[PDB]
Design a protein around this ligand. Sequence first.
Ligand code: 210
Ligand code: CL
Ligand code: MG
Ligand code: MG
Ligand code: MG
Length: 301
Amino acid sequence: EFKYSEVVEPSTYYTEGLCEGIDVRKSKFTTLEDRGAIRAHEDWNKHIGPCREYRGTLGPRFSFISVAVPECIPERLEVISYANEFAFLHDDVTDGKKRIQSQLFLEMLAIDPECAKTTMKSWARFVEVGSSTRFVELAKYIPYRIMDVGEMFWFGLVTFGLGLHIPDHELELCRELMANAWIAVGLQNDIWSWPKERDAATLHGKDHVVNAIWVLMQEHQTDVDGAMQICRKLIVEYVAKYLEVIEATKNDESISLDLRKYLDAMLYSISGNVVWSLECPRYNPDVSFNKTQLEWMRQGL
Ligand SMILES: NCCC(O)(P(=O)(O)O)P(=O)(O)O
Ligand SMILES: [Cl-]
Ligand SMILES: [Mg+2]
Ligand SMILES: [Mg+2]
Ligand SMILES: [Mg+2]
């Protein structure tokens, strides 16, 4: 079942109890994410503007894709990391000679035509219905944040990296079974991106912060630490909830073999998001990169 990654020893990483019952798996080719990610920096620095040693998907020990999508097809590992950085590089713009990224798309047709064609169209619904605020109730924030984190982007990204062909009729079915998983990673990110996003709202003149922490502070009339405790409590529960879905969806043949794989692959995106966000320079400024990672950022590839 797993032939592209290994299980990381539980006594070597911190979980904070936010992914109980899930193994932490790391891609056996993590150096491919580096080159793919760093080349996105260089292409950024060469075509749109300054970009050197950017803190995004990369980590010194756990890079996002290498640990969130550990069973990614090795030959596709570089190009997925290339796209993931541009995703990270664009979310910061959210918070033009850039149309010359058709080289990314055309590269994916050289690998898999049908998988890419759906993914590119999966990103159509993402980009086009993304541009179209301020939440004080959590029940209303969950539907929004589910989109704002990038579910459609991730769907097209993983399915290509795993080579999954889900029939067009299960597309509405799939999104209604990873609700608990997507709520989990959404609250997780809102906790660890909170400092950089709270600092962000301080400059724009924002009286609000589009973050679960701020939302909970308004809805429950509590402070920062009070919201953190509530948020962490919900994550554990929603993580548990999704784990029940897995055992229930283990044996249905009307379910695609691919979709059944994709549901299982969502587990390690949860455990991966935990170990990554706890170390990544994106949320942890004081953390430095690898010798190898730097040597390619400074000296190039
Ligand atoms: N996975 C999306 C997370 C973010 O992009 P977002 O701002 O939560 O969309 P981050 O700023 O935390 O990197
Ligand atoms: Cl821990
Ligand atoms: Mg952001
Ligand atoms: Mg954002
Ligand atoms: Mg965030």
